[PDB]
Design an enzyme around this catalytic site. Structure first.
Site, short mmCIF file in Angstrom:
data_model
loop_
_atom_site.label_atom_id
_atom_site.label_comp_id
_atom_site.label_asym_id
_atom_site.label_seq_id
_atom_site.Cartn_x
_atom_site.Cartn_y
_atom_site.Cartn_z
N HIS A 68 0.90 -1.20 -0.03
CA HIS A 68 -0.22 -0.42 -0.07
C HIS A 68 0.66 1.04 -0.36
O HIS A 68 0.81 2.16 0.70
CB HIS A 68 -0.88 0.13 0.97
CG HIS A 68 -2.01 -0.80 0.86
ND1 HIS A 68 -2.23 -2.45 1.35
CD2 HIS A 68 -3.29 -0.93 0.18
CE1 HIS A 68 -3.28 -2.82 1.36
NE2 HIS A 68 -3.72 -1.76 0.24
N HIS A 72 1.83 1.79 -5.61
CA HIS A 72 0.49 1.55 -5.89
C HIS A 72 -0.11 2.37 -6.72
O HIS A 72 -1.25 2.08 -6.76
CB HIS A 72 0.07 0.39 -4.21
CG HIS A 72 -1.67 0.46 -4.50
ND1 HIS A 72 -1.85 -0.50 -5.20
CD2 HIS A 72 -2.41 0.46 -3.38
CE1 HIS A 72 -3.34 -0.33 -4.75
NE2 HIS A 72 -3.70 0.42 -4.17
N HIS A 106 -5.28 7.57 -3.89
CA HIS A 106 -6.62 6.08 -3.28
C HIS A 106 -6.37 5.84 -1.67
O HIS A 106 -7.07 5.55 -0.49
CB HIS A 106 -6.73 5.41 -3.72
CG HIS A 106 -6.75 4.23 -4.49
ND1 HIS A 106 -4.81 4.75 -4.58
CD2 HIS A 106 -6.99 3.66 -3.98
CE1 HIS A 106 -4.63 3.35 -4.65
NE2 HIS A 106 -5.37 2.67 -3.93
N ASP A 217 -8.15 -0.79 -8.76
CA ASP A 217 -7.17 -0.92 -7.00
C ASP A 217 -6.80 -1.96 -6.84
O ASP A 217 -5.96 -2.56 -6.41
CB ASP A 217 -8.54 -0.66 -6.11
CG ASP A 217 -7.86 -0.39 -5.11
OD1 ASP A 217 -6.10 -0.11 -4.66
OD2 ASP A 217 -7.82 -0.87 -4.25
C1 LIG Z 1 -6.46 -12.68 -1.07
N1 LIG Z 1 -7.05 -10.99 -1.04
C2 LIG Z 1 -7.87 -10.15 -0.68
C3 LIG Z 1 -6.61 -10.42 -1.99
N2 LIG Z 1 -6.82 -9.26 -1.78
C4 LIG Z 1 -6.01 -8.36 -3.43
C5 LIG Z 1 -5.84 -7.82 -3.87
C6 LIG Z 1 -5.22 -8.41 -5.28
BR1 LIG Z 1 -4.72 -5.93 -6.37
C7 LIG Z 1 -4.62 -8.81 -6.08
C8 LIG Z 1 -4.53 -9.92 -4.89
N3 LIG Z 1 -5.28 -10.14 -3.95
N4 LIG Z 1 -6.09 -11.07 -3.17
MG LIG Z 2 -7.23 1.28 0.06
ZN LIG Z 3 -5.01 0.59 -3.05
#
Ligand SMILES: CN(C)c1nc2cc(Br)ccn2n1
Ligand SMILES: [Mg+2]
Ligand SMILES: [Zn+2]
Ligand SMILES: [Br-]
EC number: 3.1.4.17
Length: 313
Positions: A68, A72, A106, A217
């Site tokens: 984050h 990103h 964001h 995102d």
């Molecule tokens: C496992 N989950 C919540 C998760 N969240 C994300 C977001 C992104 Br971009 C890619 C993979 N994941 N894996």
């Molecule tokens: Mg966020």
């Molecule tokens: Zn984000």
């Protein structure tokens, strides 16, 4: 006014593609963002001096967390750029301005922890904002930076255009709260299929901009397999840190976040592509046909995770 940004040929060409990777050279990311603003919006949207000062304050207020982070921010802004360029006529002047700025801002001042972890920790931000905790903080930091002397990139808007763009940015940033994504896509799905989706209905644009934000995102799942695979390491490094902090509060974390249960990651990625990513880019493709490459790339990477499970890598 006559000062374009230009990129090397390989970047100039690849940046137009959804799957572009902004690269490991941090010092080129600001120029990449401006290049995108200039082609997406015009050379006139923003006073270059103020934009540059806004970009560098935004950069400063992203932290050194594994995922984050500033990279990103710019990655998510590039995906919005690709969506806007492949859908030229569907978006107003203000929306093009507001959405690239929304995407860059964001995740401002993210600490690598979920809304859930703030609430179990009893972090002050959880008392100030009971839902979409981090996302309300991100919008708050955006407004803070916009009000620094020399940083108001919107100064040349009318009073009412100003209020509209900050309203576009607020809804855009709130929508990056994945807890709100599920219901938002369910409604867009119904509206699309019953034929009631109307892009002149402001409440409908809001929903569609929200889905675009979820799509931008999550766009790490729409890159070439090697980019997707290495980004997932960064994502899981925050999850496991959060799982560590849950254990410190005397709470067994969900397995996703438990670093003792790394074996279960490939199956957890399957679940996520199936529960979140694929449905997200499917509905987006239906609404905005030219965003199909995001769906195709997402499907390719789902297939790559299936291969990891079957022991074929
Ligand atoms: C496992 N989950 C919540 C998760 N969240 C994300 C977001 C992104 Br971009 C890619 C993979 N994941 N894996
Ligand atoms: Mg966020
Ligand atoms: Zn984000
Ligand atoms: Br990923």
């Amino acid at each position: 006014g006559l000062m374009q940004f230009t990129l090397p040929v390989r970047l100039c060409k690849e940046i137009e593609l959804f799957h572009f990777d902004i690269g490991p050279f941090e010092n080129m990311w600001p120029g990449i963002f401006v290049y995108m603003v200039h082609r997406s919006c015009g050379t006139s949207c923003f006073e270059l001096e103020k934009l540059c000062r806004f970009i560098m304050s935004v950069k400063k207020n992203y932290r050194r967390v594994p995922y984050h982070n500033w990279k990103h921010a710019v990655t998510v802004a590039h995906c919005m750029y690709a969506i806007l360029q492949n859908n030229h006529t569907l978006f107003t002047d203000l929306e093009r301005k507001g959405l690239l700025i929304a995407c860059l801002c964001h995740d401002l001042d993210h600490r690598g922890f979920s809304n859930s972890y703030l609430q179990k920790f009893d972090h002050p931000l959880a008392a100030l904002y009971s839902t979409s905790t981090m996302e309300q903080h991100h919008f708050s930091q955006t407004v803070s930076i916009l009000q620094l002397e020399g940083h108001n990139i919107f100064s040349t808007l009318s009073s009412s255009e100003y209020e509209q763009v900050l309203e576009i940015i607020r809804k855009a940033i709130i929508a990056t709260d994945l807890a709100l994504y599920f219901g938002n896509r369910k409604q867009l799905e119904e509206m699309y299929q019953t034929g009631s989706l109307n892009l002149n209905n402001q409440s409908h644009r809001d929903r569609v901009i929200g889905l675009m934000m979820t799509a931008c995102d999550l766009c790490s799942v729409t890159k070439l397999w090697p980019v997707t695979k290495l980004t997932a390491n960064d994502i899981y490094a925050e999850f496991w840190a959060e799982g560590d902090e849950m254990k410190k509060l005397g709470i067994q974390p969900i397995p996703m976040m438990d670093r003792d249960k790394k074996d279960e990651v490939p199956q957890g990625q399957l679940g996520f592509y199936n529960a979140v990513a694929i449905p997200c880019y499917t509905t987006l493709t239906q609404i905005l046909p030219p965003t199909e490459p995001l769906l195709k790339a997402c499907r390719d990477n789902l297939s790559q995770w299936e291969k990891v499970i079957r022991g074929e890598e």
